[PDB]
Design a protein around this ligand. Structure first.
Ligand SMILES: Nc1ncnc2c1ncn2[C@@H]1O[C@H](COP(=O)(O)OP(=O)(O)OP(O)(O)=S)[C@@H](O)[C@H]1O
Ligand SMILES: Nc1ncnc2c1ncn2[C@@H]1O[C@H](COP(=O)(O)OP(=O)(O)OP(O)(O)=S)[C@@H](O)[C@H]1O
Ligand SMILES: Nc1ncnc2c1ncn2[C@@H]1O[C@H](COP(=O)(O)OP(=O)(O)OP(O)(O)=S)[C@@H](O)[C@H]1O
Ligand SMILES: [Mg+2]
Ligand SMILES: [Mg+2]
Ligand SMILES: [Mg+2]
Lengths: 735, 485
């Protein structure tokens, strides 16, 4: 039917009165950016909005904020009709009232703090019956438009009168709160959130459709990841955005009950959910109820486990119910639960990446007034090893710091703290740097999986090797069809070998960056850390996380460290298992394995077998051209004098490794800083009785050159040159 | 199981009691105990008095079938070893059925069952999918089909835009499942049983292996004849040797040969690489090794292949590798000649293989597999490039002459490497047309120029020193049981 009908989608402009279409659709229904559009949703409600163009928006979809989304009584995936509305006229009076539960903690002049800057210069199209949201004074309050003089909808011009008559109204039964959790409250893990969204939309959102079809949906989705990553958060969001009934099972609470009551509460939970289908039963801290079969020693505890198992099987009802569960330790869960027909789907909600943490930070600073000096992206880059909860907490603590120092002044009369005072409250970048020092990040020891920021431009020379890496890794990803036509499947892995400090580690990260694929680094020593017993299970989890992160490059660095320890029964079991995991790794899975070693003489020939690390790429010391590129790359970030001759520098340093060059750069720079520090003191002495000299000069290099030493001896090189010729012969007898 | 064990103490014993009474009542009957290990695990694992009672309770009812009212008791479990052996006694659960993981052909069958009701697109080729979904189990396939179906629905949400909870076979029947919808569900697949040892007939034939013709026939002597012609061996009064040992330089087709001979006899095949065996814990290893020989018995006639034995020999000087090999030695002797179970070993290092393996009755058939002659090298190069679109210009006899000393694997390297230039060229040619367009003619063929670069960059895997020793060992391998030097 008609073109005006459109599908609801996530928002990009967090602004309430803004909806977005594609320019091809904005042309189709003949609307432009300024236009005010009228939206008709379900439950016979209307909302009016400013339309805009959005390059990301698919033409059959309409991006609307969750505020708009609620006013229509609509959710993601539903259909709404959009139509131009030039008939909108400026208001005389608008009468908005707050909702009690969103203000009962806060006092002051609601009209002057929130409505004022919200409508000022905003020209917001509003509608009678709409509920809009204003964030400020570290609080978010929602007002409902009770009346407009040009009803039902009017624009809010500066001329318009806006009144609030004191006492707030209660929430209507149908009016979902915006204080509630949503997808816009979760960041940095889109990919996982997508999979969860996929599995659950079809059965929950369209229940009759799935009962009629007779094909099986997922019923048990298991969320796992480190603590505080937002597992409990996600479950609530999915339930609210789909509008499904949400029944919470808090692990500890169930297991805190008597024997009989525990099994009972489980039964009641499932029964009530089947009753109010569609629903999500969420089991938080599952390992509390159902740990490994051995550790469950204590018989009543085993009864509860089986009880749960019967209830999960009890989804024979298939009343449109999904059971979600969260756990810190996937390994702790009774494997009986991860059986088919129960918790069959697993989502790794990992630690957030750099961009992710930034996103998180933005969500928990929404309501706070931040000073201009605050650069959350900087905070984001510094907060490595931080998890969602760490960030949410540090944001809270940075706020409480800003509160305390600003309450030193208010303390002269602590009785009257107002919202007006709260909006005046600014949060300095210092308040954040403060919270950083006070932060106790949990996930520093967690294995990180993200796309590296080392690019080709950080690596000097080896240009043709970069291209061979593009052949081996990038082409089979971006051009699978092409490999199919030639009838060849690509090699699984590569082995870097060469003298120390030539860029083997950089290359592994480099090719990853080019392919925009995830990266996993595993150093030799890291593998010898695992207890004798633990090692077997930990290796398997590594290859599993590589699958999760496909397309992914798995890099085993510093293999020399392991090779030493074997010729040692511990290190041996590890590698044999790594070998086994490679073979189990299907080539089709888009998981690429790279090895690196400074010791090609002792590497296990079994690794070099066809199908494993069969691509033997030798990485030698840099020649004269490369040495220039290396020195340039490292010193990009450094303020260098035009005096410095690097090509002359290159010839002098023949025999030096890539690392040996960064050695000279750092050594020369430390003199430059040494000079900068001793000069500030001299300037200090001169004032006691403005033109600093921050730039590195020729003698600094000439001094560093004077003390520079070589990491790779000549005898070592001559052997390395030989191994470049005979490495592939090691599968026979020892060369 | 879980339902029983979720109930009160008394109710559990009662329900077990009630269950048997009902079966004898309405005989003939089947009592099905699903997830048996839930009720009766190994007695040590069952600390807690009532849990042991239920086991004993169950055991008595099983003894209680002395009634012989025509009642059969069936039971299912994930972990056979977890069951209290007291149940596996005669007069109780006396018959056991190994429902293994499906093989290639099996998976194909399964897929067909779960595509029964779906309108499958014309492009869909399940046999490819069957071959692609290795390590998948019946339920994995059941899900994959289910997920591929929901993908086809997922793609057709323009139709769902109706959003009305309305059924309409008209649109529903039009709904097809493309091969892409399978490939999507394939990438999203969570295969469980990849770690399981697979038992099937290999798809590698003689024709996939170039040369080594006389070795193929000796495998027919050793394997096929005692299978296809037991009577001849019987009248002549000799029973044949149990197993074979392949030894030679790396990449000559030892892994392929084992699978090839399996294919010819249409007999089951079990591959176990060295590293795979060293992964098992000291303790765990002992039961899994027995498990291998048992599944070999299950699948008789079967060829049991232990690959990359060099990896194990290396590791013993290791308390694991010592027990592993020593236990395998014991299992071979326990292998009765009558069982039609043939054991083949492979190693790239005959210098370090344990002499005990070479004793009569074990791997006493010492087959040396050397570098491929010119004849073989041509056949190999064709074999590898069958599946690829090659130019008529390409001279394989020329490549064969260039590659004297090269192993069979060294030839596939050249074939694959020549292809690597061709693909980058194919991509780099399309980019060139795209930049010219910005201001049906591509070349779907691998060419001599690609081969000429790959030949120039080609490498030899086997050194002369390596070859000369392999040649010496070919005559003196059987002497390693005495004093070795
Ligand atoms: N990805 C995220 N985006 C936004 N906020 C997050 C995110 N992850 C965690 N948080 C915050 O962390 C806090 C705790 O979230 P929870 O869901 O309870 O953590 P969790 O994953 O359930 O960890 P538990 O309690 O050990 S299972 C919430 O207040 C969130 O705001
Ligand atoms: N090609 C290069 N370009 C720029 N810097 C390099 C290059 N090669 C080595 N380096 C420097 O040496 C450091 C470490 O190099 P790696 O990537 O780790 O090489 P490697 O072969 O793994 O040697 P090691 O033993 O790990 S240092 C880097 O941090 C660089 O500063
Ligand atoms: N006679 C041959 N015919 C066809 N391909 C061969 C032949 N010999 C070696 N190859 C190739 O080399 C690869 C590996 O050979 P294998 O069957 O594994 O023998 P191998 O003795 O076990 O050598 P390795 O150490 O396992 S590579 C195969 O995938 C083939 O592509
Ligand atoms: Mg929680
Ligand atoms: Mg390094
Ligand atoms: Mg092999």
């Amino acid at each position: 039917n008609r073109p005006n009908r459109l599908i609801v989608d996530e928002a990009i402009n967090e602004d309430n009165s803004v909806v977005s279409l594609s320019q091809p659709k904005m042309d189709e229904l003949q609307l432009f950016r300024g236009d005010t559009v009228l939206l008709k949703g379900k439950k016979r409600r209307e909302a009016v909005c400013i339309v805009l163009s959005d390059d990301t928006c698919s033409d059959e979809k309409i991006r609307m904020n969750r505020v708009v989304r609620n006013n229509l009584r609509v959710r993601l995936g539903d259909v709404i009709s959009i139509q131009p509305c030039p008939d909108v006229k400026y208001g005389k009076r608008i009468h908005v009232l707050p909702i009690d539960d969103t203000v009962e903690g806060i006092t002051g002049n609601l009209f002057e703090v929130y409505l004022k800057p919200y409508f000022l210069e905003a020209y917001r199209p509003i509608r009678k019956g709409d509920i809009f949201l204003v964030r400020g004074g570290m609080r978010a309050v929602e007002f409902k438009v009770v009346e407009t003089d040009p009803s039902p909808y009017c624009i809010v011009a500066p001329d318009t009168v806006i009144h609030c008559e004191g006492e707030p109204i209660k929430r209507e039964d149908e009016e979902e709160s915006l204080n509630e959790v949503g997808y816009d409250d979760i960041g940095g893990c889109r990919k996982q959130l997508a999979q969860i969204k996929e599995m659950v939309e079809l059965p929950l959102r369209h229940p009759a459709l799935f009962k009629a079809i007779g094909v099986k949906p997922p019923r048990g989705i298991l969320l796992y990841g480190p603590p505080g990553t937002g597992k409990t958060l996600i479950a609530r969001a999915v339930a609210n955005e789909t509008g499904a009934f949400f029944f919470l099972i808090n692990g500890p609470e169930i297991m805190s009950k008597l024997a009989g009551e525990s099994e009972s509460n489980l039964r009641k939970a499932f029964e009530e959910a089947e009753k109010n289908a569609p629903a999500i039963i969420f089991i938080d801290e599952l390992d509390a109820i159902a740990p490994k079969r051995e550790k469950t020693h204590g018989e009543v505890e085993r009864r509860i486990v089986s009880q749960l198992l019967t209830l999960m099987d009890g989804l024979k009802q298939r009343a449109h119910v999904i059971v979600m569960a969260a756990t810190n330790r996937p390994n702790s869960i009774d494997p009986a639960l991860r059986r088919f027909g129960r918790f069959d789907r697993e989502v790794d909600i990992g630690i957030p990446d750099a961009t992710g943490r930034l996103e998180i930070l933005q969500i928990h600073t929404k309501n706070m007034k931040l000073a201009d000096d605050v650069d959350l992206e900087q905070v984001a880059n510094e907060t490595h090893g931080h998890v969602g909860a760490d960030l949410a907490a540090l944001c809270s603590e940075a706020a409480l710091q800003a509160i305390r120092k600003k309450m030193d002044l208010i303390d002269l009369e602590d009785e009257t703290i107002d919202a007006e005072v709260m909006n005046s409250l600014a949060v300095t970048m210092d308040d954040f740097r403060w919270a950083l020092s006070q932060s106790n990040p949990s996930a520093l020891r967690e294995t990180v999986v993200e796309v590296p920021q080392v690019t080709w431009e950080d690596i000097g020379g080896l240009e043709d090797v970069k291209r061979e890496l593009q052949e081996l890794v990038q082409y089979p990803v971006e051009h699978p069809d092409k490999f199919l036509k030639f009838g060849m499947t690509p090699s699984k892995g590569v082995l870097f070998y060469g003298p120390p400090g030539c860029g083997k580690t950089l290359l592994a990260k480099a090719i990853a960056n080019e392919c925009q694929a995830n990266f996993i680094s595993i150093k030799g020593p890291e593998l010898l850390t695992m207890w004798f017993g633990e090692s077997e299970a930990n290796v398997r989890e590594i290859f599993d996380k590589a699958r999760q992160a496909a397309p992914c490059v798995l890099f085993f660095d510093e293999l020399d460290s392991i090779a030493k320890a074997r010729g040692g029964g511990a290190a041996d079991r590890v590698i044999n298992q790594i070998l086994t995991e490679m073979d189990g790794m299907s080539t089709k899975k888009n998981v690429f394995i790279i090895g690196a070693t400074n010791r090609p003489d002792i590497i296990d020939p079994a690794i070099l077998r066809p199908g494993r690390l069969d691509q033997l790429i030798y990485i030698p010391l840099p020649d004269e051209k490369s040495r220039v590129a290396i020195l340039k790359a490292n010193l990009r970030k450094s303020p260098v004098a035009k005096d410095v001759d690097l090509e002359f520098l290159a010839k002098m340093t023949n025999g030096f490794s890539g690392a040996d060059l960064t050695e000279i750069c750092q050594r020369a720079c430390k003199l430059a800083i040494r000079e900068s520090i001793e000069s500030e003191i001299r300037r200090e002495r001169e004032r006691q009785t403005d033109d600093p000299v921050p730039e590195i000069r020729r003698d600094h290099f000439e001094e560093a050159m004077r003390f520079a030493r070589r990491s790779v001896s000549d005898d070592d090189i001559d052997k390395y040159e030989d191994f470049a010729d005979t490495l592939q012969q090691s599968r026979g007898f020892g060369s």
